[PDB]
Nucleic acid binder design. Sequence first.
RNA 1: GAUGGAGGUAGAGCACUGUUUGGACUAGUUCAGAUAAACUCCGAAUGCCAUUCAUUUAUAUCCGGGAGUCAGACUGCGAGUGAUAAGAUCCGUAGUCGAAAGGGAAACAGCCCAGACCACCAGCUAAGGUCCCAAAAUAUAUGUUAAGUGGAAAAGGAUGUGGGGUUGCACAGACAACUAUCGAGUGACCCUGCGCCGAAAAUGUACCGGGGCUAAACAUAUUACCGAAGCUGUGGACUACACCAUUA
RNA 2: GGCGGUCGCCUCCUAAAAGGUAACGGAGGCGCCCAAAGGUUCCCUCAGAAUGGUUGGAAAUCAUUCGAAGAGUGUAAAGGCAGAAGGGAGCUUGACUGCGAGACCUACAAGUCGAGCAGGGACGAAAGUCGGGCUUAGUGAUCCGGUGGUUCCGCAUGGAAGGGCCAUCGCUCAACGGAUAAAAGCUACCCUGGGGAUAACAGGCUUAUCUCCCCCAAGAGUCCACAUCGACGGGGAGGUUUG
RNA 3: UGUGGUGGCGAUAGCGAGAAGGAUACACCUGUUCCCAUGCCGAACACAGAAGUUAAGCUUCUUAGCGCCGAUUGUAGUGAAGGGUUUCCCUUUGUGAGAGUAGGACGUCGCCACGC
Lengths: 58, 76, 141
Amino acid sequence: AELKITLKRSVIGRPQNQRATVKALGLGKVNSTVTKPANEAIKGMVNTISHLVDVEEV
Amino acid sequence: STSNGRDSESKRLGAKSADGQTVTGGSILYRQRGTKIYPGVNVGIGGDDTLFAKVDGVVRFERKGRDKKQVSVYPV
Amino acid sequence: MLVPKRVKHRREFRGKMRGEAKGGKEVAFGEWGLQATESHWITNRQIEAARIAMTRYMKRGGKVWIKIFPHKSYTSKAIGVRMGKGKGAPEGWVSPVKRGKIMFEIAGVPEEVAREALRLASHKLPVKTKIVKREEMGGES
RNA sequence: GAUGGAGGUAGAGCACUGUUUGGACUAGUUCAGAUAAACUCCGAAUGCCAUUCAUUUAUAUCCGGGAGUCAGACUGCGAGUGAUAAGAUCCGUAGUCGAAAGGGAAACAGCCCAGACCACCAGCUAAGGUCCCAAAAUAUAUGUUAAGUGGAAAAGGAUGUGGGGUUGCACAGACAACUAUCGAGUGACCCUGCGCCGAAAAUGUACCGGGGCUAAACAUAUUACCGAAGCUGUGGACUACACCAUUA
RNA sequence: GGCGGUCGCCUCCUAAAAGGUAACGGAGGCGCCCAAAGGUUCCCUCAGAAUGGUUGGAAAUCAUUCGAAGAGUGUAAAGGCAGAAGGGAGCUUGACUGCGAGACCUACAAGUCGAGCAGGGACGAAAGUCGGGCUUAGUGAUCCGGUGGUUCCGCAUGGAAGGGCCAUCGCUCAACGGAUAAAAGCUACCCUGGGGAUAACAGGCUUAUCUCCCCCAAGAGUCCACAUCGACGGGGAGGUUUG
RNA sequence: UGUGGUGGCGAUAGCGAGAAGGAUACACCUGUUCCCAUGCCGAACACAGAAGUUAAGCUUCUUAGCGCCGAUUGUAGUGAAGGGUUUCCCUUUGUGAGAGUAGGACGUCGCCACGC
């Protein structure tokens, strides 16, 4: 259905596709959140970013 | 004091259009030495083995029997 | 010293061992083996030194199988010469050995002579080793 | 993300070309076993090219005015030259520095965390830490080490200690000791945690930052707290865009 | 820095499975050749081995049976090729003229492939194939000059002299994107501007080498490996030596 | 149905061993006058035929010795994310071979002609 996605780490020191994935979701600064639908594409973005992010099934 | 040290310019060989891409008449599909790939429906061979379209359509890389490959172009 | 007759290329690259033996990790022709537990280069002179030591101890012969061959050459430059021009001249032959490889085999002689001979061969070599026998298959005599 | 595709690398293999060990044999082919950068019967992960495709997001292309740059450096990773030496040299790929302040690493361009519009004698965390210097646990349970190991170094050597296995000989009497008895055990092997020797340089201890430590060390778990110019709280400045009724 | 080598172009490895990618890194070729070794129509199938046979031998030339390629492909190597691009025979000159939708490569200038249209042809009964050769090296801007063509211009007019346009020729301009038509040395006798962008002592990093310390132990030591010495081999420390 | 012809599909379609068969058809076989031919040869190719025969090709059927098509689960490698000395090695998460095997397999789909 939906997922709350909060940014817990920084993007300094990471490669470019991970930066651009954080941008494609609409996450700006540390501890800013976002809510998205549950898809197979959004889950792929979350799986690319998992080490930087917390996710809660909402 | 070595007697090596020379090379020739790279030639940019390979595939120049993709599977499933639409293409206009005359566009190059593949640059090679000898027939690694063969010409198929609506495709020609040049003087130095380059493969080209004759007609506008989609590109499809296929298998020619047991051990060879083919390119064809199919109009809509 | 073992030397390959007739190489195809005079110089070559060196790397990149990254240990784990690809080939003979079991005893094939003898009763007892000498298995390397580290990975290193092994030269002509080290093999001949080990072989001479191993055979001298076995009065009444027996048999010995050398299962490691130096295929790859060295090169080196000389003292007093600045960096720069092409590779040096080849000086030596070596075989890369990776951990797991059995390197010698002995038969026709009871345990203690075989064990002493394999003990004397290992002090001539730059690797850590174990001693192994033929263990268990459909047929091992 | 899904679908199709081009291509011979990391494997590993010996059908082809080089290199190679044993055995049977005979003309007077065979059975096994290896190996490769310019070998291949085979062959990934990833990257790359597409699509009237999907979900989020805000860029991309075209014309014109003005530039600056053409000495880079270190650190992962993968290759060559070198001796698989160099804070060496030359390429590929990612980051930081350059042009980046703030916390940690004693001091430290490039490592670890994190990007400073401004005010506060407010709060929560990151990396890293909590006996004193110096903010926070002389935390909790169970073990190991005696060497100041922790807090520089190898081949090899040894009845140092913890744990798990395989067995020879034992009250129809064991090993050791005593001549010519004794009244419990005694040898020999394997893998494994942590320690010991091997260990000698020039102004003064002199790689724990110091004091000092038998835990304030090491292993496995568990919960509190400290900790930044990161995030939050209250207020102010400037910009954009949506709202709004003209008043912006 | 000098001395030595190299300077354009082609093929492979390096090169990390698209394309691209350095080094005074590892290996080789080119500066042409063919009037058929080009086009087209018919037809054909290789290298070896074994068996016999007079000279004739291992091996010239005959016959049979196995033989997916272990041969050939003008020339280097890679990729291709036995529905041949390999090998024979007949006829021929398409090794044509005007061109060109669209692609590839690419800083520029250049380089590469091209279906199809028109004129007039070769081979073949046709269908058809043919704008050199299995593919990729065999080449050099512009200025200036020579030869042939021309329904172009021509300083009052008609001519001429001279020029333009089209086709072709003259390069080891090889330092091969080519300075000028034309070019070598000495300075301890020296001068100015820059650079620790660059060489020498000392420092730093590294330890091949060097000095020292060891492990194993064949042996020597009358006997006896270890009183003393220690072959073939293996592992470290030091920062005084040559680098 | 049987046989002749001509086609698709990766040899799971092939190779070797073995059997059988002449109804039409297919072949071998017989000849060189005439169209054509041999770098010698009517061997081949070309033509005229129809005595002879299923021996060879061909067709059908049996056979898993050689080839071919091969899973599963285990390893080797390797995207991401981390840790020791950093020559090399290790732990999570995702992907996953080449070998080696269980099995498959002695074809399958279609048009025309003639005969039963």
